[PDB]
Design a protein around this ligand. Structure first.
Ligand SMILES: Nc1nc2c(ncn2[C@@H]2O[C@H](COP(=O)(O)OP(=O)(O)NP(=O)(O)O)[C@@H](O)[C@H]2O)c(=O)[nH]1
Ligand SMILES: [Mg+2]
Lengths: 205, 123, 994, 15
């Protein structure tokens, strides 16, 4: 029960950061450009069983485009990503969409406006209308604040399974289990960890 | 969900970090409710924490009596401690964890409940 | 082992290629990742297109072929003209001959749609290069082949769809203006034959796959073809009847009719008006009989999500809203069209009840268009009385918390709807309120939704109707609160009650005794430990105060004192249970009231009493802090100090120029506190290292400094007496902050220092030229060294640095003239450094600084500094600007790069540079700067873009310089150059387009 | 009925 999801959009819009947040829960602060593409299995637990996404995180910078529209072959769903603080990334959404539906002619697609956590938003909400005539689902998202970060996958799972009432449910929590040769090893890592400051100390949590 | 055979002694909103030793860096693991779960049939208390919205487990281990809560250099609302068997994502792996709360008060009360729970696991 | 295909010395192993492809697509893990890196290297090889002949001929893998068409595609789009023409003949004939071979094989024509579509698109790339000049029979031969096979005829529709897209929909960015117009003209002059083939296939059936592909291509044609092909044929009848019947063609046909509702049509012919009415009547008829009647519950249908129902209801809303916004006046006069008009809107009413935010925003936009027109247009609102009555209920029941954009859209429609029928709106709202009390629709979400609705229509009823409505609403809401048990219930009702009254200030202002009783309750609520109550009471308080401040500052009848005095007197008791951030909101509110007192002595006295508690804590601490600074290591003391300053920021935010007396009370000791705090931060990083800046201890001390700078910035930005600013505030400020910033390690410098200085220069920069010089000397070089090693580190210092330089360049350009020549050189480097940022906050200011600097230099006239500036830095600015224009990594700054470039070019072609821009040796004497500018530019582009011919570079510059007074044409010429540098062999005549 | 709501506001409670 696995589906291939292609993730397309301009370089720097946060496609890789969004996947990393779902994979490990980490927020990667640095921009290391994706080269060609990175495939990652992502599993969610639903009331209809586990759902597996094979996420094809493609590259947005043309210099690193790799196979480009070759990554889309046989895709069953897709996310198109832009950045609401960069109007050019929204201007290019019709280009990514065109290249996408030329290969995948009938798949559910989610359009995502990322980085709504930034206060100086440039692509205002009333200006985002491209999804209407193309029957895409749209979400304001932010990988940094997690605002709506689960919605693109919930909506795609509902469309791929055909159950509008599918829901994410809590995975079962097994009981966790209960040497001196590593007492000095763990203490070494423990004190360098204490002296490394936690990131984002001004956040609410 | 495999949680009804347990009782909830403590519940606090928190952000959990894991230390990447090879990479000089703290990395977030999840934000959500941290619960102290006491098993009704063994009287063992564990840490269960899940991620908001997706409800994925990002912390699952017993409050071992040998663990010790240490402050971190840049926070008066966090604790750092070594964990030797966490099963949040498969096999029981060793982690250096950091856990941050909304205030110094919730951090202090977490330490209170964390060590009380250690005494129940001692018997 | 898999890397064998990367060796072109040997011959291709097709079988080895099919495996590494299969290991990439159907594989996983490390072997998939490795097959990926080899397939990228293979396709990226400049000779791989040569082996595309045999891949697409002998391979059995459709993915391997697809990949090789990509390799071909990159060749056709970028290096086509550079090939020997024999290869252009071969690739052309191979690509076509394949397409027919796949079309005739019904097996493959059905199983490999992806590959056939990729081959059609590859053909379209060739047509962009070769057609029609070297292929004028393509369209006649395309029409001829179509009658031979249904499969080739369908595929021809796909080729034509793709051709129309590349030429008309996606050409503006991908080809030159000249080449686009050439292809548009070509298609335009051969469309008559394409349409007849399209109309014949639609009219004669019968293959649904062939009909749909022809309807998909028709959708693209309607973007550009002239009106007559739609209104002078029968095609509107076919779309609105025959093809609305089958669900296979219903989706595409709806999108076609949506585009038709946007065609350019003469608004005076009454036949075209009847054709626009007729296809709407037919379409609505087919929907009512073949899909669902107007009574159908589209809410439930959408939620069930069977088949393509969701996409269909979305397209139906797009069709109805599009058509009615343009043509509904065609239906409003004739009595025989009245049922069609109201049925269309009744479908919209049902669509508007679907739980789907983006769809709802689409219908809401149309409702706004409609009710705005009924509000202004005579004799129209009676037509829609029953549509509007239903819409009121739909909007009141889907009110959202005040996305705020959605709320403001809902409020606007509902205010309109209330003016169209005030009596209906009140009856609905009181009715909904009754069912909130009788428990039939009681819910936390449902009482909130209704309060927001009630609050949103404020100011739309007559004052006396409003008075009775507000009274009735508050009365029922309180009876709702008493009826409810438990805290969590009684807290939400009481909150809504406060939200409603906060929305009706005209009512509050006319009934002082009520307004007084309100505020007194919020004060009681500021002790309610239940979460949300306190935050609620404080937000309502400042909200009411903003609207009713005048009634707190005057002495109302039958009171002895302005109510502000009563608030201030009990302020300690009132706020005793609030968090610091809520205390600051409270004080800010009191500052709003006080500023309404325009008797200076009374205002200052009110200010003195409001600040009594923070001033007493301040005086105590400043006496205990000075004797002696060990107290500042106490976390509690720095917190108390931070909150005192924040309280001062809050009151200063609302009082502005009137805050000056309170600032003068603390100013000198505050700057002293700034110095003491600064020493401890420095002492701590010395005693513990850079990690000390992360500790709570030092973060608390830096908070004090930041709040002090924010207070001074807040005042100076709003001061009206600037003489006191310069003569009293500026000098002690600079002494306190400039040297401390300069002499701290980078990690201990506060970027707020730059932001504060930007405000000082903004307000009084023209009055303190020696002060602006001192600011530059102390922050310019040491900040530049922090930010000129990458684009990453110190992001805040980066943004504030260039805002500071920008305002200095605007307000006191004299300061840059006083820079030593070495420092001015760093200034120019800093500007170009800003060009290269992807960060928009830096890039936009850097371009603006460069533009303003050029104008600053131009305004100096023929003087040595202006002459030396051009000799040293003109061609640096020209080439740095050209670099970011052409490197494809700064597209977001194109418009301002072009503006700067034209300003630089126009300088030379207007002869405003007096000295020659060359060395006396390199060019003969008397040569104009204009001749030398063209030579420098030709040489610069030739080395930067060696694949361009000399004629290309020469025709580009000739057009560019000639167009340096026309920004829109200039920009088009830059865009044409950006296209030509992406390929080989661009036509130099393209630059004669304008 | 203004003095009426008024008196009701006064008694507004949560306990
Ligand atoms: N403030 C903020 N930053 C974000 C957010 N999401 C991603 N970023 C940041 O934007 C930058 C780009 O990150 P990245 O995930 O690599 O974007 P990308 O689309 O994958 N780039 P590419 O297409 O070249 O692979 C990162 O520095 C990241 O921290 C966000 O939601 N909020
Ligand atoms: Mg990436």
């Amino acid at each position: 029960v696995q589906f291939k999801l292609v993730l397309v959009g301009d370089g720097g819009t946060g496609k890789t950061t969004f996947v990393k947040r779902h994979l490990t829960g980490e927020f990667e602060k640095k921009y290391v450009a994706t080269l060609g593409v990175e495939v990652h299995p992502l599993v969610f637990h639903t009331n209809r069983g586990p759902i597996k996404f094979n996420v094809w995180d493609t590259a947005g910078q043309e210099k690193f485009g790799g196979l480009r529209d070759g990554y889309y072959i046989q895709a069953q769903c897709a996310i198109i990503m832009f950045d609401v603080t960069s109007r050019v990334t929204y201007k290019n959404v019709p280009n990514w969409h065109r290249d996408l539906v030329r290969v995948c002619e009938n798949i559910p697609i989610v359009l995502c406006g990322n980085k709504v956590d930034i206060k100086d938003r440039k692509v205002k909400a009333k200006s985002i209308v491209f999804h209407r005539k193309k029957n895409l689902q749209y979400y304001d998202i932010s990988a940094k604040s997690n605002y709506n970060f689960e919605k693109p996958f919930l909506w795609l799972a509902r469309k791929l399974i055909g159950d509008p009432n599918l829901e994410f449910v809590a995975m079962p929590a097994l009981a966790p289990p209960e040497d001196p040769a590593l007492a000095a090893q763990y203490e070494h890592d423990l004190e360098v960890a204490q002296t490394t400051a936690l990131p984002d100390e001004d956040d609410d949590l | 969900t495999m949680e009804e055979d347990e009782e909830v002694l403590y519940k606090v909103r928190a952000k959990l970090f894991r230390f990447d030793a090879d990479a000089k860096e703290w990395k977030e693991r999840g934000t959500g409710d941290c619960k102290f779960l006491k098993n009704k049939k063994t009287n063992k208390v564990r840490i269960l924490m899940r991620r908001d919205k997706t409800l994925k487990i990002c912390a699952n281990h017993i409050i071992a009596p040998e663990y010790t809560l240490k402050p971190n250099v840049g926070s008066d609302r966090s604790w750092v401690y070594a964990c030797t068997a966490d099963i949040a994502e498969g096999e029981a792996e060793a982690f250096t964890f950091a856990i941050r709360f909304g205030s110094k008060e919730n951090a202090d009360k977490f330490k209170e409940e964390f060590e009380k729970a250690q005494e129940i696991n001692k018997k | 082992s898999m890397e064998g295909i990367l060796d072109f010395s040997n011959d291709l192993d097709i079988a080895l290629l099919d495996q590494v492809v299969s290991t990439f697509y159907q594989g996983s893990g490390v072997q998939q990742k490795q097959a990926q890196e080899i397939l990228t290297k293979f396709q990226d090889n400049p000779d791989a297109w040569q082996k595309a002949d045999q891949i697409l001929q002998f391979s059995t893998n459709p993915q391997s072929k697809f990949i090789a068409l990509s390799i071909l595609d990159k060749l056709i789009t970028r290096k086509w003209k550079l090939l020997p023409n024999d290869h252009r003949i071969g690739i052309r004939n191979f690509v076509v001959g394949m397409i027919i071979s796949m079309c005739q094989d019904d097996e493959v024509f059905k199983t490999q749609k992806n590959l056939i579509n990729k081959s059609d698109l590859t053909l379209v790339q060739i047509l962009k290069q070769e057609w029609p000049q070297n292929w004028p029979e393509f369209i006649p031969e395309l029409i001829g082949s179509s009658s031979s096979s249904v499969n080739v005829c369908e595929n021809n529709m796909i080729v034509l769809k793709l051709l129309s897209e590349e030429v008309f929909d996606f050409s503006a960015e991908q080809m030159t203006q000249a080449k686009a117009l050439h292809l548009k003209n070509s298609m335009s002059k051969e469309f008559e034959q394409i349409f007849k083939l399209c109309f014949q296939v639609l009219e004669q059936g019968s293959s649904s796959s062939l009909i749909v592909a022809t309807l998909e291509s028709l959708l693209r044609y309607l973007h550009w073809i002239p009106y007559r092909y739609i209104y002078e044929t029968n095609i509107l009848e076919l779309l609105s009847t025959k093809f609305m019947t089958s669900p296979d063609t219903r989706a595409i046909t709806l999108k076609c009719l949506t585009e038709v509702s946007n065609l350019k049509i003469p608004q005076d012919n009454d036949l075209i008006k009847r054709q626009t009415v007729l296809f709407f009547q037919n379409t609505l008829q087919q929907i009512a009989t073949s899909v669902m009647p107007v009574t159908a519950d589209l809410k439930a249908t959408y939620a069930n999500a069977n088949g393509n129902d969701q996409s269909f209801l979305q397209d139906l809303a797009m069709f109805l809203t599009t058509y009615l916004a343009r043509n509904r006046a065609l239906l409003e006069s004739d009595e025989s069209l009245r049922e069609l008009l109201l049925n269309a809107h009744q479908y919209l009413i049902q669509l508007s009840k679907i739980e789907e935010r983006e769809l709802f925003k689409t219908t809401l936009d149309y409702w706004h268009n409609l009710v705005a027109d009924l509000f202004y247009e005579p004799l129209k609102k009676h037509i829609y009385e029953e549509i509007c009555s239903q819409l009121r209920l739909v909007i009141i029941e889907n009110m959202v918390r005040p996305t705020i954009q959605l709320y403001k859209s809902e409020r606007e429609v509902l205010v309109y709807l209330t003016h169209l029928n005030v009596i209906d709106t009140e009856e609905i709202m009181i009715s909904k309120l009754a069912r909130q009390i009788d428990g039939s629709e009681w819910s936390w979400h449902n009482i909130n939704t209704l309060s927001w609705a009630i609050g949103s229509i404020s100011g739309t009823m007559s004052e006396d109707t409003e008075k009775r409505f507000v009274v009735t609403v508050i009365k029922d809401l309180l009876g709702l609160c008493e009826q409810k048990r438990g805290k969590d219930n009684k807290a939400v009702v009481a909150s809504d009650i406060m939200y409603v009254v906060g929305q009706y200030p005209r009512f509050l202002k006319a009934h002082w005794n009520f307004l007084r009783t309100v505020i007194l309750k919020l004060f009681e609520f500021m002790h309610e430990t239940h979460e949300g109550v306190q935050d609620m009471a404080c937000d309502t308080f400042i909200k009411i105060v903003q609207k009713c401040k005048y009634h707190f500052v005057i002495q109302q009848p039958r009171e002895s004192e302005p109510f502000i005095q009563t608030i201030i007197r009990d302020i300690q008791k009132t706020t005793a249970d609030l968090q610091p951030q809520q205390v600051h909101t409270f004080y800010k509110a009191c500052g709003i009231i006080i500023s309404e007192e325009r008797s200076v002595a009374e205002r200052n006295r009110l200010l003195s009493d409001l600040m009594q508690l923070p001033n007493m804590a301040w005086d105590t601490i400043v006496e205990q802090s000075t004797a002696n600074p060990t107290l500042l290591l106490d976390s509690e003391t720095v917190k108390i100090i931070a909150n005192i300053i924040k309280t001062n920021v809050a009151v200063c935010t609302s009082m502005g120029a009137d805050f000056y007396p309170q600032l003068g009370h603390i100013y000198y000791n505050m700057l002293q506190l700034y110095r003491a705090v600064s020493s401890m931060i420095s002492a701590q990083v010395a005693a513990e290292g850079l990690i000390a800046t992360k500790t709570p201890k030092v973060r608390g001390l830096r908070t004090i400094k930041k709040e002090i700078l924010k207070l001074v910035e807040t005042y100076i930005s709003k001061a009206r007496n600037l003489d006191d600013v310069v003569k009293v505030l500026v000098e002690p400020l600079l002494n306190a902050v400039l040297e401390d910033y300069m002499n701290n390690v980078p990690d201990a410098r506060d970027a707020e220092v730059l932001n504060c200085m930007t405000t000082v220069v903004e307000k009084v920069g023209h009055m303190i030229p020696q002060g602006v010089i001192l600011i530059l000397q102390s922050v310019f070089e040491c900040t530049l060294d922090m930010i000129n090693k990458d684009f990453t580190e110190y992001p805040e210092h980066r943004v504030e640095f260039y805002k500071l330089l920008k305002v200095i360049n605007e307000k006191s350009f004299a300061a840059f003239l006083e820079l030593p020549p070495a420092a001015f050189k760093l200034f120019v480097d800093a500007i170009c450094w800003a060009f290269k940022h992807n960060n928009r906050d830096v890039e936009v200011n850097g371009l603006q600084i460069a533009l303003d600097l050029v104008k600053n230099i131009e305004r100096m006239g023929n003087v040595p500094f202006a002459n030396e500036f051009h000799k040293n830095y003109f061609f640096i600015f020209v080439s740095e600007t050209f670099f970011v224009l052409t490197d494809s990594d700064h597209k977001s700054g194109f418009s301002k790069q072009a503006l700067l470039l034209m300003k630089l070019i126009s300088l030379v072609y207007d002869n405003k540079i007096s000295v020659p821009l060359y060395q006396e040796a390199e060019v003969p004497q008397g040569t104009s700067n204009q001749v030398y500018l063209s030579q420098y530019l030709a040489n610069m582009l030739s080395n930067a873009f060696p694949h361009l011919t000399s004629e290309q570079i020469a025709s580009f510059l000739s057009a560019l310089t000639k167009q340096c007074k026309d920004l829109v044409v200039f920009k088009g010429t830059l865009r044409d150059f950006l296209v030509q540098i992406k390929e080989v062999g661009g036509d130099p005549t393209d630059y004669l387009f304008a | 009925s203004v003095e009426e709501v008024e008196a009701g506001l006064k008694g507004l409670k949560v306990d």
